[PDB]
Design a protein around this ligand. Structure first.
Ligand code: ZN
Ligand code: ZN
Length: 86
């Protein structure tokens, strides 16, 4: 539904052409960076598109800090490769 459903900003983006219309958010919000949501400032996460919590951010880019890394130390080592015997 092309409509900015932001508590502090109830916009009716019925005719938009960008990455804000595909997330129920107006351009003003997409550019505003942060919005005074329900007693909480949310930040448009370009990684997921949806809104996120500002206090849950870090220096590493402007996105959530969850599931940011996983495929890095993926290796299979074997210091034994024989097992016990006695
Ligand atoms: Zn808005
Ligand atoms: Zn995110």
């Amino acid at each position: 539904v092309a409509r900015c459903q932001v508590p502090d900003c109830e916009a009716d983006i019925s005719e938009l052409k960008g990455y804000h219309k595909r997330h129920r958010v107006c351009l003003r919000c997409a550019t505003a960076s942060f919005v005074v949501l329900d007693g909480e400032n949310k930040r448009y996460c370009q990684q997921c598109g949806k809104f996120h919590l500002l206090p849950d951010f870090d220096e590493g880019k402007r996105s959530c800090r969850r599931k940011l890394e996983r495929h890095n130390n993926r290796r299979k080592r074997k210091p034994v490769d024989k097992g016990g015997v006695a």
